[PDB]
Amino acid sequence: SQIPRLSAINDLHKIWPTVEEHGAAIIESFLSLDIVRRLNEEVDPFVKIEPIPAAKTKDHPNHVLSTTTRLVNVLAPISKAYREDVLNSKVLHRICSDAFHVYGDYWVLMGAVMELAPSNPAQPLHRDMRFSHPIVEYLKPDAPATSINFLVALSPFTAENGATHVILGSHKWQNLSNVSMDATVRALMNPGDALLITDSTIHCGGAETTGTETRRLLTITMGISQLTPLESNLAVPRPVIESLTPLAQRLLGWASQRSAAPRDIGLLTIRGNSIEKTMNLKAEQPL
Amino acid sequence: SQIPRLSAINDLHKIWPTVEEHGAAIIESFLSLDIVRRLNEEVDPFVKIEPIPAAKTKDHPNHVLSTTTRLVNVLAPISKAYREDVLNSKVLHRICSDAFHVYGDYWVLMGAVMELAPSNPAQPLHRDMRFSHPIVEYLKPDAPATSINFLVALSPFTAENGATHVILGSHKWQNLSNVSMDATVRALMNPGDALLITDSTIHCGGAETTGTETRRLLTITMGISQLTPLESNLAVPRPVIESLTPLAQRLLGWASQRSAAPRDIGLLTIRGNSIEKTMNLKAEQPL
Numbered sequence: 001s002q003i004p005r006l007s008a009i010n011d012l013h014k015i016w017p018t019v020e021e022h023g024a025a026i027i028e029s030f031l032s033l034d035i036v037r038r039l040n041e042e043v044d045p046f047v048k049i050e051p052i053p054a055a056k057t058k059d060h061p062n063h064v065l066s067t068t069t070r071l072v073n074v075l076a077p078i079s080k081a082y083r084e085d086v087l088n089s090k091v092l093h094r095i096c097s098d099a100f101h102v103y104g105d106y107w108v109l110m111g112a113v114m115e116l117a118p119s120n121p122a123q124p125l126h127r128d129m130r131f132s133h134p135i136v137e138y139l140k141p142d143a144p145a146t147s148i149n150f151l152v153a154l155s156p157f158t159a160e161n162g163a164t165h166v167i168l169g170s171h172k173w174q175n176l177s178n179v180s181m182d183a184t185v186r187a188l189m190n191p192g193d194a195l196l197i198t199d200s201t202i203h204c205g206g207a208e209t210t211g212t213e214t215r216r217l218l219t220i221t222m223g224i225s226q227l228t229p230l231e232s233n234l235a236v237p238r239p240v241i242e243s244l245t246p247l248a249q250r251l252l253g254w255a256s257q258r259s260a261a262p263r264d265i266g267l268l269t270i271r272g273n274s275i276e277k278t279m280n281l282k283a284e285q286p287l
Numbered sequence: 288s289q290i291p292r293l294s295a296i297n298d299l300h301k302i303w304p305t306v307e308e309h310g311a312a313i314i315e316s317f318l319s320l321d322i323v324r325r326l327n328e329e330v331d332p333f334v335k336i337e338p339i340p341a342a343k344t345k346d347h348p349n350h351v352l353s354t355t356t357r358l359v360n361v362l363a364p365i366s367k368a369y370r371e372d373v374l375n376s377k378v379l380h381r382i383c384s385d386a387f388h389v390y391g392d393y394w395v396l397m398g399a400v401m402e403l404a405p406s407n408p409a410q411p412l413h414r415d416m417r418f419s420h421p422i423v424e425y426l427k428p429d430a431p432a433t434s435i436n437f438l439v440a441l442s443p444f445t446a447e448n449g450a451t452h453v454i455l456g457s458h459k460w461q462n463l464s465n466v467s468m469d470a471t472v473r474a475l476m477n478p479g480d481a482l483l484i485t486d487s488t489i490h491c492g493g494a495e496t497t498g499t500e501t502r503r504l505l506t507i508t509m510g511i512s513q514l515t516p517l518e519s520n521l522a523v524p525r526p527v528i529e530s531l532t533p534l535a536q537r538l539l540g541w542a543s544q545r546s547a548a549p550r551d552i553g554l555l556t557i558r559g560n561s562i563e564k565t566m567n568l569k570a571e572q573p574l
């Protein structure tokens with residue numbers, strides 16, 4: 001039983017429901033080739049200057065990722081393609097609104113580009129959020145997913161190069177005795193394609209067996225605005241922020257947020273008023 | 288059966304365990320009279336110029352609070368007593384650290400001064416966070432509290448003036464069939480005393496029957512860093528922020544946060560580094 005593939009331009013409303021039922025979906029041509037090329041181009045140097053995850057020079061080192069992994073987050077300052085095309089993607093927003101309607105507003109928990117070097121070993125099967133948000137493990141099983149992850153291929157995902165393994169239907173599992181690599185299916189994708197999974201979906205990066213190929217992806221974790229993000233955009237220059245759309249500003253934490261409660265009082269408010277209104281924050285102002 | 292009253296200076300380790308078991312506790316002399324006096328002095332103007340909760344001039348109106356209540360949050364820039372004495376209170380930090388060890392770092396969800404005018408009606412029994420964080424409702428019942436509320440009396444709490452009603456043991460309730468004002472006990476307090484309750488504790492503001500007395504309190508909601516705060520400190524002048532201690536900076540969202548996960552990757556980080564290191568934020572620098 002393989003992962004469901006859906007069109008990003010045709011069968012839309014079918015994406016979230018599909019992931020909901022199966023826990024994983026592949027969205028063909030989520031990003032266009034032109035968009036991928038610009039992103040690749042823009043982040044290229046930052047990826048080459050990124051040290052190992054657990055570098056000693058970091059005060060918040062990542063001890064979970066392998067030494068052959070380079071992860072670059074806080075992409076709004078680095079790339080125009082990400083902060084304009086990606087953050088405003090209509091397909092992403094429709095999927096998110098469908099997924100998080102019961103909770104309310106959603107934002108970016110993390111936007112990052114990941115590069116796996118040649119001979120990168122396979123990760124152990126896991127679920128996202130366990131190393132940052134312990135609260136998630138205390139949610140009731142029928143609770144709707146609080147975060148989802150868009151895994152966009154910036155390069156080819158093949159069996160030989162480490163394409164993502166996924167266990168279909170495991171987002172609903174309560175007993176984890178059944179977890180094994182034998183229950184997984186692969187996510188073979190071309191650049192621009194995206195694998196969508198919920199925070200409860202068991203999966204893992206594959207093993208790179210060629211010794212040649214380098215795999216890159218853009219990982220976008222979207223979550224309800226009630227959860228603190230992994231990355232911060234506080235230090236992003238005002239001009240950049242003021243250059244984005246109000247929607248993008250909100251996803252980045254530069255706006256107040258709302259919940260689904262009928263008489264919602266809001267998040268990140270300032271004495272009854274929004275962050276943006278208090279600060280008279282401009283939007284869509286070019287550099 | 289009345290609310291347990293504990294000393295803030297002696298029986299310190301008994302406060303959290305007491306609240307955990309009973310859902311509420313009075314902490315006598317949580318703030319000293321000098322601190323209270325300064326706080327009152329400092330926020331007095333902002334309380335008098337505050338409009339009704341659902342003022343039409345606000346973009347994030349509060350339709351739940353009554354029209355005779357004035358609520359003023361984002362207190363760091365207004366008061367030195369709050370931002371220095373209160374945010375650094377040793378009692379508060381020992382309580383929070385004991386409450387939230389399971390989850391990790393905690394911060395301020397909201398710091399607010401509340402004033403109730405004469406003849407303020409009694410609120411309906413309720414639980415906090417329902418109009419802002421719908422996620423809380425999907426937590427398993429054995430999940431440790433994700434937020435707690437310090438209700439500090441800035442004026443006297445009497446039966447006649449509207450002192451807070453609480454239903455002891457109601458934080459462990461799954462069935463809300465027997466919720467009634469008849470199950471409640473009062474929190475009679477002198478200025479500086481604090482009523483501590485969990486997010487699951489059923490309570491309500493009392494009715495002020497004198498027609499003359501005004502009741503004021505400082506409400507402080509402390510929650511795990513994994514939940515988004517209700518108030519934002521983004522627009523607080525940097526000098527002010529750079530004036531606080533590092534701990535206070537963290538409680539205000541002007542620092543990166545950590546969780547209890549063994550190989551924690553952190554929250555609000557910037558490419559492996561903290562907000563404070565990235566921005567080279569100064570601390571304890573007088574105005």
Ligand SMILES: CN1C(=O)c2ccccc2NC(=O)/C1=C/c1ccc(C(F)(F)F)cc1
Nearest residue numbers: 064065066123124126128129130131219552
């Ligand atoms: C730690 N971590 C991340 O760094 C991360 C990286 C990109 C996008 C989301 C993301 N969120 C997480 O919770 C997370 C899970 C995770 C990664 C690797 C392994 C290993 F085991 F394989 F190593 C286990 C678990």
Ligand SMILES: CN1C(=O)c2ccccc2NC(=O)/C1=C/c1ccc(C(F)(F)F)cc1
Nearest residue numbers: 265351352410411413415416417418419506
């Ligand atoms: C809306 N609300 C607050 O404004 C608030 C105000 C100060 C400190 C925490 C706090 N947390 C909440 O989610 C909340 C609960 C709440 C207040 C009044 C009533 C009424 F109904 F009684 F009014 C009901 C519910």
Ligand SMILES: [Fe+3]
Nearest residue numbers: 126127128203
């Ligand atoms: Fe993962």
Ligand SMILES: [Fe+3]
Nearest residue numbers: 414415490491
């Ligand atoms: Fe309340």
